[PDB]
Amino acid sequence: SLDFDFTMAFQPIVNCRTKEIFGYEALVRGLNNESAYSVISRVNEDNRYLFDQMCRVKAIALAAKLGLTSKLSINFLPNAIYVPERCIRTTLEAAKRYQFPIENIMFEFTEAERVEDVNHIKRIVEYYKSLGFQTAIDDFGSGYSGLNLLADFQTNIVKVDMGLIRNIHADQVRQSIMKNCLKLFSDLNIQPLAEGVESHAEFAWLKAAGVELMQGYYFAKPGFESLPSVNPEFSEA
Amino acid sequence: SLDFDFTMAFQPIVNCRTKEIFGYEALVRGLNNESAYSVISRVNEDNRYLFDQMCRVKAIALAAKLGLTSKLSINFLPNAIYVPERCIRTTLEAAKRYQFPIENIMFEFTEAERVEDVNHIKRIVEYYKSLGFQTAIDDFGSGYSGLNLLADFQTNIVKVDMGLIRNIHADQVRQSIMKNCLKLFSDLNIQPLAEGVESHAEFAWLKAAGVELMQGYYFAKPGFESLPSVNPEFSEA
Ligand SMILES: Nc1nc2c(ncn2[C@@H]2O[C@@H]3COP(=O)(O)O[C@H]4[C@@H](O)[C@H](n5cnc6c(N)ncnc65)O[C@@H]4COP(=O)(O)O[C@H]3[C@H]2O)c(=O)[nH]1
Ligand SMILES: Nc1nc2c(ncn2[C@@H]2O[C@@H]3COP(=O)(O)O[C@H]4[C@@H](O)[C@H](n5cnc6c(N)ncnc65)O[C@@H]4COP(=O)(O)O[C@H]3[C@H]2O)c(=O)[nH]1
Numbered sequence: 044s045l046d047f048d049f050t051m052a053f054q055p056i057v058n059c060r061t062k063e064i065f066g067y068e069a070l071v072r073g074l075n076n077e078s079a080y081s082v083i084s085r086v087n088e089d090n091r092y093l094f095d096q097m098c099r100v101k102a103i104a105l106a107a108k109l110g111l112t113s114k115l116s117i118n119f120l121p122n123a124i125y126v127p128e129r130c131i132r133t134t135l136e137a138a139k140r141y142q143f144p145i146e147n148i149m150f151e152f153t154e155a156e157r158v159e160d161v162n163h164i165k166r167i168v169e170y171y172k173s174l175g176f177q178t179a180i181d182d183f184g185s186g187y188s189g190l191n192l193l194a195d196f197q198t199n200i201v202k203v204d205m206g207l208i209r210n211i212h213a214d215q216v217r218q219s220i221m222k223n224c225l226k227l228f229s230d231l232n233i234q235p236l237a238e239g240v241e242s243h244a245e246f247a248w249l250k251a252a253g254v255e256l257m258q259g260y261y262f263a264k265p266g267f268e269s270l271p272s273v274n275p276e277f278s279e280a
Numbered sequence: 281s282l283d284f285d286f287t288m289a290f291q292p293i294v295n296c297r298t299k300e301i302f303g304y305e306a307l308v309r310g311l312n313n314e315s316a317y318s319v320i321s322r323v324n325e326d327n328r329y330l331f332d333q334m335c336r337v338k339a340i341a342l343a344a345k346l347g348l349t350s351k352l353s354i355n356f357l358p359n360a361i362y363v364p365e366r367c368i369r370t371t372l373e374a375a376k377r378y379q380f381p382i383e384n385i386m387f388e389f390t391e392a393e394r395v396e397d398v399n400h401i402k403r404i405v406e407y408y409k410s411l412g413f414q415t416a417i418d419d420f421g422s423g424y425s426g427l428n429l430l431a432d433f434q435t436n437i438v439k440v441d442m443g444l445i446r447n448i449h450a451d452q453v454r455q456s457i458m459k460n461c462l463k464l465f466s467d468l469n470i471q472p473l474a475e476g477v478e479s480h481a482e483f484a485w486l487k488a489a490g491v492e493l494m495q496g497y498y499f500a501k502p503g504f505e506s507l508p509s510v511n512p513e514f515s516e517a
């Protein structure tokens with residue numbers, strides 16, 4: 044073990060077709076709502092497995108304490124940790140003590156590590172899918188999270204990076220990128236999710252294009268140790 | 281300022297529609313055909329801009345000595361100190377002295393390894409296009425080189441990474457990625473180039489799906505200080 048402490052904020056993912064909440068992403072904060080980066084910047088190589096586990100337990104315990112009945116999304120620590128089976132029971136144990144279905148837990152793989160050689164996140168994704176977890180590719184269209192991931196394995200969901208979503212209602216290039224990626228997603232039976240939606244104009248274009256799942260300040264900012272309600276402008280039109 | 285010396289190999293790019301050679305990529309080799317990895321291993325921060333400039337001039341001089349009449353494709357090294365604006369003169373002087381038309385020189389931009397700045401390699405790409413150079417995004421669909429690049433700037437050509445190409449006649453996920461990227465490249469009016477083609481089966485599929493420009497061992501391996509001829513089996517049907 045116990046070097047430093049932190050907690051979670053939660054940000055809803057909204058199904059714009061049914062206007063209900065698909066789930067919440069768990070986002071780490073310091074005890075006074077300090078930033079995620081200011082917490083993760085204290086995570087080094089020696090306490091990576093401890094911090095990984097504590098994030099998982101902390102997100103599961105808080106979501107359950109707050110009464111989350113939809114999905115809980117947890118970023119998988121990008122550091123390609125090994126023996127994917129080692130300390131997966133620490134996540135299985137936590138979900139059992141809070142009676143939280145494995146099937147309601149989605150791990151988001153945000154590949155952005157030091158070495159561009161680690162395709163064996165495929166081993167981890169296929170293992171986690173075998174236990175019943177949902178899976179997502181995070182930050183698709185940025186960093187390392189690219190087509191190279193889709194080529195070798197497919198997750199339930201792909202979170203399109205907010206760089207690709209910003210101002211898309213009037214950016215012809217991003218429009219074409221998204222149009223052709225959605226058909227790719229459809230061909231791969233993968234569900235899209237647009238992240239970082241900030242304005243109604245982006246929302247309205249994404250929804251016409253066929254995206255149902257969306258996340259962003261437009262719907263709700265992350266809520267410190269709380270499960271935010273979603274913007275009235277969208278939930279009543 | 282020459283701590284060591286090297287030279288070049290050249291590998292043809294074939295336009296399979298017109299059945300003629302589009303150009304040659306210049307690939308650095310050791311003086312005894314040592315690997316490009318072995319030559320770039322000796323590049324540190326101190327001799328970065330020096331090595332770079334030597335690469336471009338060496339490639340132009342050799343190409344001109346060997347009698348190249350088509351395009352010459354040069355890799356723009358990532359971490360190319362990211363401040364070119366004035367230091368393109370050495371490339372412009374070399375092209376003029378060896379009477380090599382600048383419009384037949386293509387630069388291949390493999391990555392944006394200055395991610396603290398956003399428009400960084402966009403700044404360079406637009407500058408070299410403004411001079412009349414050809415440009416290409418290299419290793420598309422692998423590594424850090426992907427859709428995030430296409431969203432903010434467009435080159436004349438996008439070379440699709442051979443990881444996405446490998447065994448594509450057999451791999452239905454890769455067939456879908458490529459079908460939908462090809463239509464995206466069409467929408468953006470970017471000419472696709474398939475890299476690393478190794479067999480006929482791959483070539484025939486890529487050809488049938490509308491790729492014209494291709495490169496790889498199936499056509500010819502890189503030629504040490506030479507301009508290799510292209511395999512007769514593809515040009516004899
Ligand atoms: N400009 C903008 N930003 C938005 C919007 N909606 C959400 N954001 C923010 O984007 C980030 C998405 O999280 P990420 O997973 O892509 O990066 C995350 C994630 O990669 C990483 N992280 C890694 N492991 C984590 C972990 N166990 N728990 C929480 N965060 C973790 O911390 C990074 C910091 O994210 P954050 O909390 O500051 O901001 C959120 C979120 O508040 C939006 O609409 N507009
Ligand atoms: N397995 C396989 N490899 C192939 C095939 N066809 C070509 N290759 C090779 O793939 C590499 C494509 O070059 P790249 O730009 O994608 O990576 C290049 C490039 O990023 C960099 N580099 C090489 N020459 C450079 C140069 N002159 N200037 C700046 N950077 C250079 O080093 C890497 C290795 O060059 P290489 O000679 O060993 O291999 C070539 C090439 O010889 C193929 O069909 N199968």
Ligand SMILES: [Ca+2]
Nearest residue numbers: 118151153181
């Ligand atoms: Ca995430």
Ligand SMILES: [Ca+2]
Nearest residue numbers: 181182202238
């Ligand atoms: Ca993300």
Ligand SMILES: [Ca+2]
Nearest residue numbers: 305355388418
């Ligand atoms: Ca290249």
Ligand SMILES: [Ca+2]
Nearest residue numbers: 418419439475
């Ligand atoms: Ca390449």
